[PDB]
């Protein structure tokens, strides 16, 4: 089951894609790129998760953070905010 008290993924992720959508609303290239990174990273994460460990994920935490870091220059706010999402361990 899911929760309802103190929603982190909801408010955070939603406001994330929202702010970025309204920010680079004129640049669909960089926006599509980022989305493509998380997309491929998602599928690689799911598959690798179902595999166990004998699988070799294509994109890792460093792959995404790097490409994303290259996607933007003067806009580091996105990189930091994104880091907040990056699973802590």
């Amino acid at each position: 089951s899911l929760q309802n008290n103190q929603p982190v993924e909801f408010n955070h992720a939603i406001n994330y894609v929202n702010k970025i959508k309204n920010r680079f609303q004129g640049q669909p290239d960089i926006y599509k790129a980022f989305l493509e990174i998380l997309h491929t990273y998602q599928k690689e994460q799911r598959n690798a998760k179902e595999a166990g460990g004998n699988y070799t994920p294509a994109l890792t935490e460093q792959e995404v953070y790097a490409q994303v870091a290259r996607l933007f220059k003067n806009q580091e706010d996105l990189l930091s905010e994104f880091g907040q999402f990056l699973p802590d361990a």
Partner: peptide, 23 residues
């Protein structure tokens, strides 16, 4: 009011968030 990626963006985002400090 709001329109997501209409794909699975909410999933990957929810993954990084939930997995944070988890496991």
């Amino acid at each position: 009011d709001f329109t997501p990626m209409d794909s699975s963006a909410v999933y990957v985002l929810s993954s990084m968030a939930r997995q944070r400090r988890a496991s």
